[PDB]
Amino acid sequence: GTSKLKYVLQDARFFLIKSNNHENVSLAKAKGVWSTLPVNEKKLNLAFRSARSVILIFSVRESGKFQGFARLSSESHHGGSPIHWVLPAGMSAKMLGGVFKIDWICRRELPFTKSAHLTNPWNEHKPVKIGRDGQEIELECGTQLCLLFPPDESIDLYQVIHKM
Ligand SMILES: CC1(C)CO[C@@H](c2ccccc2Cl)CN1
Ligand SMILES: CC1(C)CO[C@H](c2ccccc2Cl)CN1
Structure with missing residues (x-):
């Protein structure tokens, strides 16, 4: 292992990302x-x-789990290859902003039952699973949450470290 993971998470910022469907997380x-x-x-x-690192921690609404976490590798940008997201009814892709590039750190799931001991000081000390899309997670809570995920042996953090 967890050493390179701990290095990537050092002095990172963490944000809860809430998706309405698994299809968008898969994309x-x-x-x-x-x-x-x-x-x-x-x-x-x-x-x-x-x-030095901004970490997005993903959860599909109603799934009772987090689906993994990733590091921003860019700010948002427009005009790239379009992404065939599942938009909510009545909403358009022009309502969205740019596209952020991300590098996945863990693509494995974590059930909310395993994070019940972690509360987020930036959301009234509620359990870290609770929060609106975009809610920032304080450093210590976010670090411990990321360390709870099963290790993702398919990922090599060497190239991630070089982007910092
Ligand atoms: C360094 C810091 C982010 C400062 O704020 C602390 C805090 C936040 C909310 C309620 C109480 C306290 Cl002590 C947590 N660590
Ligand atoms: C980008 C995405 C994964 C899919 O599209 C969603 C959306 C698009 C337009 C208006 C509202 C909303 Cl929620 C937001 N997240």
Whole structure:
């Protein structure tokens, strides 16, 4: 192992990402991309310039689990290869902001039952599973949450470390 993982997480910032469906998380895992609404896009762009690593921790609503976590490798950008997200009814892709490139650190699941001992000081000390899309997770809570995930032996953090 966990040493390179701990190195990547050092002095990182952490954000809870809530997806309405598994299909969008699968697309993010396959393509290394994420997009969010403009209020959260602005927060994440500020964070990306502010810290050595910005970590997104993903949870599909109603799943009772986190589906993994990833590190921002860029600020948001427009005009790239379009992403065939599952948009909610009535909503358009023009309501979205840019696309963030991300490097996955763990693609494994973690059930909320395993994180019940972790509370987030930035969300009223509620269990870390609770929070709106984009909620920041304080450093110690976010580090411990990431360390609870099963190790993802398919991932080599060597190339991630070199981007910092
Ligand atoms: C360094 C810091 C992020 C500062 O804020 C601390 C805190 C947050 C919310 C309520 C109480 C306290 Cl002590 C946690 N560590
Ligand atoms: C980018 C995505 C994974 C999919 O699209 C969602 C959306 C698009 C347009 C308006 C509202 C919403 Cl929620 C947000 N997350």
